[PDB]
Curated annotation (Swiss-Prot):
Residues 1-56 form the SH3 domain. The chain holds residues 85 to 140 of 533 of the full protein. Belongs to the protein kinase superfamily. Tyr protein kinase family. SRC subfamily. This is Proto-oncogene tyrosine-protein kinase Src. It comes from Gallus gallus (Chicken). It is found in: Cell membrane; Mitochondrion inner membrane; Endosome membrane; Nucleus. Non-receptor protein tyrosine kinase which is activated following engagement of many different classes of cellular receptors including immune response receptors, integrins and other adhesion receptors, receptor protein tyrosine kinases, G protein-coupled receptors as well as cytokine receptors. Participates in signaling pathways that control a diverse spectrum of biological activities including gene transcription, immune response, cell adhesion, cell cycle progression, apoptosis, migration, and transformation. The phosphorylated form is termed pp60c-src. Expressed to high levels, and with a high degree of kinase activity, in certain fully differentiated cells such as neurons, platelets and macrophages. Isoform 1 is widely expressed. Isoform 2 is expressed only in the muscle. Forms a complex with polyoma virus middle T antigen. Interacts with AFAP-110. Interacts with GJA1 and PXN.
Length: 56
């Protein structure tokens, strides 16, 4: 479980928007730049920038 450090607005069809403070479950971290995540706060799924979140 990770927490969002900053708001992120999705710019494409596979990334996930989230608000600062949202809690997320990381599903796929094979790549170092983009992680597939699942929002525990909102239940939505998509790719997020890995440097927008921190473990919590």
């Amino acid at each position: 479980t990770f927490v969002a450090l900053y708001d992120y607005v999705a710019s494409g069809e596979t990334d996930l928007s989230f608000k600062k403070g949202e809690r997320l479950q990381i599903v796929n971290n094979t790549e170092g730049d983009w992680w597939l995540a699942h929002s525990l706060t909102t239940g939505q799924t998509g790719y997020i920038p890995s440097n927008y979140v921190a473990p919590s």
